[PDB]
Amino acid sequence: PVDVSVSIFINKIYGVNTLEQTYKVDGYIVAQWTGKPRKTPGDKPLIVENTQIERWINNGLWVPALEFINVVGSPDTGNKRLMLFPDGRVIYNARFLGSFSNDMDFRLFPFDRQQFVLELEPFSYNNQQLRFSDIQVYTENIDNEEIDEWWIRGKASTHISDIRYDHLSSVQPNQNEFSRITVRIDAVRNPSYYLWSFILPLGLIIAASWSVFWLESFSERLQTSFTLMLTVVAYAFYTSNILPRLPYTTVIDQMIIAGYGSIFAAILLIIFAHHRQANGVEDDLLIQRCRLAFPLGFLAIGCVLVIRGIT
Amino acid sequence: PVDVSVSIFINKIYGVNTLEQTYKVDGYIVAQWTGKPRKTPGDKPLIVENTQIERWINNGLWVPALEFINVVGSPDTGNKRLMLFPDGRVIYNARFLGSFSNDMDFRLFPFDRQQFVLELEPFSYNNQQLRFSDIQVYTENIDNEEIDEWWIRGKASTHISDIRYDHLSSVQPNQNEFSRITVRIDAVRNPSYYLWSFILPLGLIIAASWSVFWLESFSERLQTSFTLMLTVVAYAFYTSNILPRLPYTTVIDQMIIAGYGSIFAAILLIIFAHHRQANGVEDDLLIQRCRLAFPLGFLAIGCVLVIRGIT
Amino acid sequence: PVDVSVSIFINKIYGVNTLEQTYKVDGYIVAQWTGKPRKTPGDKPLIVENTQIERWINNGLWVPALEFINVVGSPDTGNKRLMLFPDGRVIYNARFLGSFSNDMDFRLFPFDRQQFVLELEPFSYNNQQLRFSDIQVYTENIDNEEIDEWWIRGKASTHISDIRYDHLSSVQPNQNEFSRITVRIDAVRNPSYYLWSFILPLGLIIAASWSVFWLESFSERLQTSFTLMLTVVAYAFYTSNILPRLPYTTVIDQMIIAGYGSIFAAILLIIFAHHRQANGVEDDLLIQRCRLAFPLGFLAIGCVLVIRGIT
Amino acid sequence: PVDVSVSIFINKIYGVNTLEQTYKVDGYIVAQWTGKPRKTPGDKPLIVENTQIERWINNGLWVPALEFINVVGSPDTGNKRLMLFPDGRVIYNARFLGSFSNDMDFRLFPFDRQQFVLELEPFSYNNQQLRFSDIQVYTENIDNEEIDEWWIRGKASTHISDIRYDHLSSVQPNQNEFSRITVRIDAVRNPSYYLWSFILPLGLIIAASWSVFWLESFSERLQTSFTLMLTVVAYAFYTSNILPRLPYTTVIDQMIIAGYGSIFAAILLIIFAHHRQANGVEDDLLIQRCRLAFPLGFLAIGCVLVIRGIT
Amino acid sequence: PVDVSVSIFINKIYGVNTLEQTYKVDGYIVAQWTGKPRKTPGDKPLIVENTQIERWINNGLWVPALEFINVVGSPDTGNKRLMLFPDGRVIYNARFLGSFSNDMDFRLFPFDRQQFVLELEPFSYNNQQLRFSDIQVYTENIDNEEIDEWWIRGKASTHISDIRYDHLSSVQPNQNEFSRITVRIDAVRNPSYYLWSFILPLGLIIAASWSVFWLESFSERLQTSFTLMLTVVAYAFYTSNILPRLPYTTVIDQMIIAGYGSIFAAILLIIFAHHRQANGVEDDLLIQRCRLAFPLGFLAIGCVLVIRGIT
Numbered sequence A, B, C, D, E: 001p002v003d004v005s006v007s008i009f010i011n012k013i014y015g016v017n018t019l020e021q022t023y024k025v026d027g028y029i030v031a032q033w034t035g036k037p038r039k040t041p042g043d044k045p046l047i048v049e050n051t052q053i054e055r056w057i058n059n060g061l062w063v064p065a066l067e068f069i070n071v072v073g074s075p076d077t078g079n080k081r082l083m084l085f086p087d088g089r090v091i092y093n094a095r096f097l098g099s100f101s102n103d104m105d106f107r108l109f110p111f112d113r114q115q116f117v118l119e120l121e122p123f124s125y126n127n128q129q130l131r132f133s134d135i136q137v138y139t140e141n142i143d144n145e146e147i148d149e150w151w152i153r154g155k156a157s158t159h160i161s162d163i164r165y166d167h168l169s170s171v172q173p174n175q176n177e178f179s180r181i182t183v184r185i186d187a188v189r190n191p192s193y194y195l196w197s198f199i200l201p202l203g204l205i206i207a208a209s210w211s212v213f214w215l216e217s218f219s220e221r222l223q224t225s226f227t228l229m230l231t232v233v234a235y236a237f238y239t240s241n242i243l244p245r246l247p248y249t250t251v252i253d254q255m256i257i258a259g260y261g262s263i264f265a266a267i268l269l270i271i272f273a274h275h276r277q278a279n280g281v282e283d284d285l286l287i288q289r290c291r292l293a294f295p296l297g298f299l300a301i302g303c304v305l306v307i308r309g310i311t
């Protein structure tokens, strides 16, 4: 088995696509193994750049192809380089930008924690085995972290494992296990834009909706409920036009649904308080009792949604 | 006829485009046939990766080109690999990401069932025949299925058939039939975001529109009908800005049309109840009889649309 | 002159871009001519696929380049293939996906008829002449036609003509005429989504705007006219956010302009009926006479626009 | 110096991007010079198409590279062709589609005049000099001009000049001057969609805003001013969602700003006319004097903006 | 060490993407070093263009690969050129268009200052050292500067430094330091569109919101507060649909939040002034005292945000 040591440098993680559950990573790959001794000009390391690599492969140089098994498409490889030492060592160094996919769950959207993952695996070998994985995310974004969309916690997690492919050759004593390198980078979204421009104003609109119980006429309470209903629709548009698309409801959308429910429940109470001929449009304490019971009932419902997400 | 056995691995189905009726599939192709015996270094399997394949074809190696006849454009092939055994077997292994087209019908949009299809066919041979097709959708997304946009039901359907091209050579005793592999994957859309953020609030807006018959003045009933009309337009915008574009009306759009109709029919009844000098603005039971007849009439219409889609 | 027979297969017409007046076509090209007799292995047809074609051209095989003179850019050619018969025949078979441009006129937008056009012409020869053109649009989309955006009427129109380039060599006895193949496919847009979700509700909003003449106060008529004006603006946004961009006004936009005009003309009549001290805010039959004259006047204007488009 | 004669054919100008100040041009380049006499098969012109050109360059054929110095990126060259005559002439013919940049000024947006520019220059030669430039915009779009986004006035302007690069070799007696071909095509935007769907309705909304001075109550005048303020915001959204993005204000945006100013100035006058206890809510001719002074003052302001743009 | 002198020409800086913190730069690279003397045809400079460069590298010409270490992906290189002098000098000249990333901070969005950065570094050498860097931004955009999105202040800053990579070979006496060229171009955004179409009208809407304290009824003050609340939501949509996406709040968004707060604080005061039975709906000077205290309190808050950004 040819031992291969790998170092991954991460320069930039960006472009998270929520519907496809993909993200872009730009960085370097440094693979190093040990072949047989060779003679190089000047008995010093020999450097072979981008298009000269292909001429060495045709002459019989063994350069294993390393594939990302989560990449969507083909990574946009930039500059490549080989460094053939006279004692046998070979260092392969490449620049990559690709779109990677992972199971990402945005159900706590403004406060979600993701885990960007890179999986590396030799494309056509089972007994060329990876030993060391060093991940150097040298971008110490701890400084000026508050201007970045994603905060990166911890350094990185590396893991060398053996993946078994049972859908393989009949003769598979050890001919169906492939070495795999997994890199995990934890991240936390930056909940400042979504906490000041989406959640705070939505709390004020819903809070102002309970003001409808302070008007002093049945006709006034009903008519201003439709303006409130139009305000929430105009707010669900401002939200859905900015927030990322998802196949489930986040915590912002569940507040909007509660906004529709609060206004609609107010309309039923306004109508019921007016047309029950036991309190009627005369002295009626159902409205006064509703000035207090509506904020409390909504606050309790806000707690049920706040424990559903955490659990 | 050279027998070819094919295995397709499906990694990711995503990016459904409703107007073009296309979708993206990423996975592997494994073709295997049996040529003539050859001598390989060490009498062990020989591996030929990406750019070394072209050097073997120039020397006379027979590598048939397999084409997807539903792909839109050219698939973005990544890593390729040949494995030439000494006893004659040849295994071709490639990575593909392409955009595939199929007749997709979204007329039940939030509850539609699709059928993603891959069709494979040799590009230039009629007596190189495919025998086996194994489809391994190993992505057991049954776990964490609720965070995915599409739920995949069943395993997969494979079928090897013979397609006849009558627009072909004059001498076509058997020279116009091509083997074809068809793969079908059933799917069901995830109706949670569209059932809580589009259908439920739309039911509340239309339900609140019937509240206009509880106001106690002709001037009030007419003026609040225009606010309701503005609310539905503001809702048709919030819907059309998120839902996928289609050349027909889905079930959400047919509710919006009923929303316009309900408000417009209310305006005619409000005006007619006021200007018929047989009940007039005095004691008038046409409005009271309309507090009940409007929700029932709309509920019945909702059933007609609910049976049109199923049938 | 080398006679060339051409067959075009059309698989998919989609992606109409209204501003650029381009559309995408995916299909096959089959060119067939007759060269000089050659000797092939086994005295049977010889097949030369994608990258092996270039090795035959370098050895002196004559493969004329056929260009689409309406394509915007360069078509994305997929698989290619040559079939060299021993008696001299050569069949060239390629897969193309390109963006094609034609003079498209959308002035009747929801009911417009287009004409998708493909123009083929040898890139560098004047006495290599095309004789036969067969267009096989085998996609019998007559079934499930109602789920497609474009309905295709008729089969196809083919035409072989000679284009003269006067901007050419001084010696042009016949050295400036190029054979050209023109393919025309008629189509009609699917006017169901645009007839139920854009035209019908717009007719209801404008019809409900004439209800402003049934209110019984000058203050009420004026104030509800501004809500109507806001409704039409909110509707012109919902329309312009979905309809394709164009450099002229379609029939939907001309109804919106009439919507603005009807409301604005109503405001002038409401104000004039109140401030003319010959009928004044007292008994005034100008408003009653306007309950009828407004729908009729608007209906007549709708006919003028309905004959302008047809003519 | 090798004399080079150039002909540019323009097929399509489209895709104007206002923020980047770029546009797309599709057409042909025909370069012709005179080398040394050669012997061709049959003593007739020899044609060398796309990939065979590279084999002639390797054997020492001089084919200068012509670069567009305004192109953003690299043009998407399609088919190429050489025509080597036996008497020495060489004709180079290529198909290009590229994105070109020029200083474009949209400050009169709906009535702006642009000037699409192509600049051509040999990439690495100073004494290979261009003599003739013929620009053949054969697209006589005078017919069906009204369905096109851009109207093209005049034919074309050509100019062969010498550009001096002072940032060049120390020995630059004449080794720093490069021949340059400049092509200019005048154009005028099609002001029909923007004159009927954006300017006319905006004139009606602002005109209807002056109707607020005809209501007969302080409470009514103030409340309907906020509906008008909401209408203009709803209109600035419909405008900014369709008009191209720019780093300055066009003439449409300056009308919207005047719309905000007119409504806001109306609010101050309504409040001031009510709370000055010299005319008060009693008989007050400041409002009546404002029914006339507001349209005139706004008309005069419209003239100041109409002379600022022209000057 | 081989001395390399570099000149960068900048043609166009555009396409700033605020979420990815990237921008596009188009220009030239001119590298010049001195190899060993060679014999050229005619004893004059020899020019080797695009595809002929690769044939010289295969024969042993040393052409170091220069990489941009901030580029996202791979730059779209256009025309290349070598100029081999007989005395040994070699000049490498290339055209590039790439997407570059830098730490960009938009927290003062309409008045932000950016710093576009290009970093150049040899890809595989440590003792090939860069000496001179000349940056020639010849685009004297001082003229017609007001039609450009970005104003460029100063000329350019160049810097040649040594970057140490400690993650490198065990034998690193000097084998881990790489020469680096850094180019910085200061810029200031053009605050005209965002100062007239976003900040001025937002100041008028908030100013008009304080007019609610001049109405003379509790019912009128409350109902027109909800129209104001709808206006601000309709304005936050018009803003968020045009302004660039960011992960923090700019100065425009902080005014919108103050707009929500001002209206919501007004609602509490309106309700409190009506339901405190010490001033009540009778003669109440809390509203009059609020006609003045609201503009002043908001003006002071506007100063706190105006000093937070500067500090």
Ligand SMILES: CCCCCCCC/C=C/CCCCCCCC(=O)O[C@H](COC(=O)CCCCCCCCCCCCCCC)COP(=O)(O)OC[C@@H](O)CO
Residues within 6 Å of the ligand: B268, B271, B272, B275, B276, B277, C207, C208, C210, C211, C288, C291, C292, C295, C296, C299
């Ligand atoms: C299906 C609708 C489609 C289009 C929608 C149109 C938009 C809105 C609709 C309004 C009408 C709805 C039903 C109303 C039925 C009318 C009720 C009725 O029969 O009795 C009298 C008729 O009205 C009158 O005075 C006027 C006499 C004529 C009757 C009504 C006016 C013409 C209606 C124009 C229709 C458009 C046709 C064209 C469509 C393209 C009124 O009592 P009256 O006199 O004691 O007091 C009136 C006061 O002004 C003085 O006291």
